[PDB]
Nucleic acid binder design. Structure first.
Ligand SMILES: [Mg+2]
Ligand SMILES: [Mg+2]
Ligand SMILES: [Mg+2]
Length: 803
RNA sequence: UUCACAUUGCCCAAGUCUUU
RNA sequence: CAAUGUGA
């Protein structure tokens, strides 16, 4: 229940493709290096201040201690040198003055780089984390002081240009950096990125950008409360400088001319003490420091401090500008990374040099294989087979494997009759019925009910009327004007209060229909009503299907940046047939920002019970695709969640012990793959083709992991999903697990495309997002209330309501 | 709220200090 | 999922 399995073999399936990865090979010396523990008092200092302290300390005490030695430092408590310091094992207390600190330096160990080499060649069974940590500190040392660290990235203002976003914000470009072991060598993983920062500009200019002034001379008088409040929202919490740096905690209500402190005015204080006559005395002051004290700075003497990341959500226009500034095709992204590596020149970093490290300036070459897609079987008379090409197929001249006959359905139009007229509704209905008949999901007649309504209050009484009036009602089609709170109310009432299938459609897609939008709509309707859109070609499936097996997908979704109290949402879905096509869902609220799925045992039990009810088989294997767990959480998550799956089995039946395969899926990581050969680039975005698989060179030196880019890249640079097998009772070969994973990406019911993660994992995201919708403005008695909100109706429990 | 892909928002990571 | 783009 602990150590991940070794890689069983390497995959052999599929034609080869030449790739380049944004991994840059490192040459690491084979010497010991030294680790010292540092303590700085006071210790409440920001990491960057600590780095400054240790910098001043090293230069100052070079005589006593650091002769020709260039230490690296993590900004907390860890210091490394390439040669021993003349300290012994003895602690030393050092006094360092910073333009006032006590610093103790105590040795703690020797880190062997030889051992890391041995572990990379699979001699040693495991990778020494602390050694990789040391190398990371070496590589981060100088950029952490030169640039602004954000996460594992570094950002700086661009030289020679500006990317304003408006509102006092601008784009900064930067790069991700991390050190990774691989089958080949140590690798430096580098990617480019961009994020929003506040412009270092005078606060007066900041005010102008936020209140949409061309100049401040526009604002004759004091600000309106409306303006002053808008300004306060934007600058509160930001750092400003006058030498002195300060955080802003408020904006005064009174202008500097009449704002007073004990008792004297602000404008008069600066006249007398600093011999300064304010322009703009009609403007308010920033309050800074302790909000309980009374330190006020006129706007005119303040600059926004450089290098503060913007944490607040961008406006829609700012987002537009950001996308426009940063979107790149895959070849353009590849060239940006390569260009950055040639300019970064890691090898003349004197700390990199001190530690004898070399970094290749060219991307690693790696060979991929492009897996063949499964064939897709449809139904009706013809039982048509679709063949995916470059990640896509379509349903033209095909009928659903099992299509639902729709006999009783209603329309509720919450869009205004003046815009979405009865003629629109009639036309939409005629076109929908045509497409549905072609798909083998015949809508046998007109709806039983078609009415206009307005506002969230009308939803529940209408739906109760419908449920009570129309026996055999299968579907309510709900037309919505655009973004509206009515949508969340429809899903509260449908999914959780009354247990009724609903399909919402925006008015614009009723007013003007296309065959492709209507066809996609039918994919969802058939699914919601219990149909089987299509199945993997049965004889083309891997051998795991010869015995009963259940596929689980699991995700936790965390609340947005800055949020302090909302729950995290855990979702787990399980397959319910042998195809595998149909799924049931479970969902829970749990502790804020907890990744481990707390109630997983109960959720899996529910799904196992429903699987047996649906198939009359007990799974001999459980294949668990777990989304979104980072490497630094693998052991904690595996420990709880593998045992929770076992617990669900044991409590169902004594000696019921199906084999478990536990696979982490990670869409968001920093590995990018590019075609080496221009003639392999697919489409306008120039990405690798769907089915591109990598399990050599850049993957783990001992464990069982692979990249699989299962989808067609439409825009930008494709994220190749990564799969790490943390447990495998079933002893899959690489080929069989890779092919299984790819085939499951072709079972997602909402589109005739291979998607970027397996259908079970994708459904878990949809379930979590629907629960978030059930919680809008609602997020022990507390836990109970949130838990009630996400519990679907008894009649919804067994459905694919989340599609 | 037709759908996918892509950017950001999500665990790990990162971040958080003292004269008006 | 939401904001924004690219597409079918
Ligand atoms: Mg997640
Ligand atoms: Mg943390
Ligand atoms: Mg969107």
């Amino acid at each position: 229940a602990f150590k991940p399995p070794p890689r069983p073999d390497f995959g052999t399936s599929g034609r080869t493709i030449k790739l380049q990865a944004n991994f840059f090979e490192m040459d690491i010396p084979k010497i010991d290096i030294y680790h010292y523990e540092l303590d700085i008092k006071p210790e409440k200092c920001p990491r960057r201040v600590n780095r400054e302290i240790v910098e001043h300390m090293v230069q100052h005490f070079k005589t006593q201690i650091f002769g020709d030695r260039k230490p690296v430092f993590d900004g907390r408590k860890n210091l490394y040198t390439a040669m021993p310091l003349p300290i012994g094992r003895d602690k030393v207390e050092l006094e360092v003055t910073l333009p006032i600190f006590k610093v103790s330096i105590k040795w703690v160990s020797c880190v062997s780089l030889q051992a890391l080499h041995d572990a990379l060649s699979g001699r040693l069974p495991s990778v020494p984390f602390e050694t990789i940590q040391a190398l990371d500190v070496v590589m981060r040392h100088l950029p952490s002081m030169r640039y602004t660290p954000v996460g594992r990235s570094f950002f700086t203002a661009s030289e020679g240009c500006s990317n304003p976003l408006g509102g006092g914000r601008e784009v900064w470009f930067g790069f991700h950096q991390s050190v990774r072991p691989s089958l080949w060598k140590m690798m430096l993983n580098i990617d480019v990125s961009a994020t929003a920062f506040y412009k270092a500009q005078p606060v007066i200019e900041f005010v102008c950008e936020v209140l949409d002034f061309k100049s401040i001379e526009e604002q004759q008088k004091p600000l309106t409360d409306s303006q002053r409040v808008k300004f306060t929202k934007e600058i509160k919490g930001l750092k400003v400088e006058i030498k002195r740096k300060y955080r802003v905690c408020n904006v005064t209500r009174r202008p500097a001319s009449h704002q007073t402190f004990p008792e004297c005015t602000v404008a008069q204080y600066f006249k007398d003490r600093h011999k300064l006559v304010l322009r703009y005395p009609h403007l308010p002051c920033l309050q800074v420091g302790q909000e309980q004290k009374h330190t006020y700075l006129p706007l005119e003497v303040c600059n926004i401090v450089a290098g503060q990341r913007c944490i607040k959500k961008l406006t829609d226009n700012q987002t537009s500008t950001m996308i426009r500034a940063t979107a790149r095709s895959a070849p353009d992204r590849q060239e940006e990374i390569s260009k950055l590596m040639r300019s970064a020149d890691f090898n003349t970093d004197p700390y990199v040099r001190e530690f004898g490290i070399m970094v290749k300036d060219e991307m690693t070459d790696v060979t991929g294989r492009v897996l063949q897609p499964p064939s897709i079987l449809y139904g009706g008379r013809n039982k048509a087979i679709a063949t995916p090409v470059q990640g896509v197929w379509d349903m033209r001249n095909k009928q659903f494997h099992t299509g639902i006959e729709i006999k009783v359905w209603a329309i509720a139009c919450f869009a205004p009759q003046r815009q979405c007229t009865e003629v629109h509704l009639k036309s939409f209905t005629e076109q929908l019925r045509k497409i549905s008949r072609d798909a083998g999901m015949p809508i046998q007649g007109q709806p039983c009910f078609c009415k206009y309504a307005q506002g969230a209050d009308s939803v529940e009484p209408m739906f109760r009327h419908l449920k009570n009036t129309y026996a055999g009602l299968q579907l309510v089609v709900v037309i919505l004007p655009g973004k509206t709170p009515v949508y969340a109310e429809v899903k509260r009432v449908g999914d959780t209060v009354l247990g009724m299938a609903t399909q919402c459609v925006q008015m614009k897609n009723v007013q003007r229909t296309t065959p492709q939008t209507l066809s996609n709509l039918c994919l969802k309707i058939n699914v919601k009503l219990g149909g089987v859109n299509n199945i993997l070609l049965p004889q083309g499936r891997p051998p795991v299907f010869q015995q009963p097996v259940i596929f689980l997908g699991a995700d936790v979704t965390h609340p947005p940046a800055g949020d302090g109290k909302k729950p995290s949402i855990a979702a787990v879905v399980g397959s319910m047939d042998a195809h595998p096509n149909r799924y049931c869902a479970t969902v829970r609220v749990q502790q804020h920002r907890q990744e481990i799925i707390q109630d997983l045992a109960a959720m899996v039990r529910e799904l196992l019970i429903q699987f047996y009810k649906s198939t009359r088989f007990k799974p001999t294997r459980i294949i668990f695709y777990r989304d979104g767990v980072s490497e630094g959480q693998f052991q904690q998550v595996l420990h709880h969640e593998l045992l929770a799956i076992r617990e669900a089995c044991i409590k169902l039946e004594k000696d019921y012990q199906p084999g478990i395969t536990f696979i982490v899926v990670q869409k968001r990581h920093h590995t990018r793959l590019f075609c080496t050969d221009k003639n392999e680039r697919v489409g306008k975005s120039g990405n690798i083709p769907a089915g591109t698989t990598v399990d050599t060179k850049i993957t783990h030196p001992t464990e069982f992991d692979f990249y699989l880019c299962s989808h067609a890249g439409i825009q930008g640079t494709s994220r190749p999903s990564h799969y790490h097998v943390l447990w495998d009772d079933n002893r899959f070969s690489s080929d069989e697990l890779q092919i299984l994973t790819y085939q499951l990406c072709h079972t997602y019911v909402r589109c005739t495309r291979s998607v970027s993660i397996p259908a079970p994992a994708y459904y878990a995201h949809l379930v979590a997002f629907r629960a978030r919708y059930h919680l809008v403005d609602k997020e022990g008695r507390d836990h109970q209330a949130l838990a009630k909100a996400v519990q679907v109706h008894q009649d919804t429990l067994r459905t694919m309501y989340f599609a």
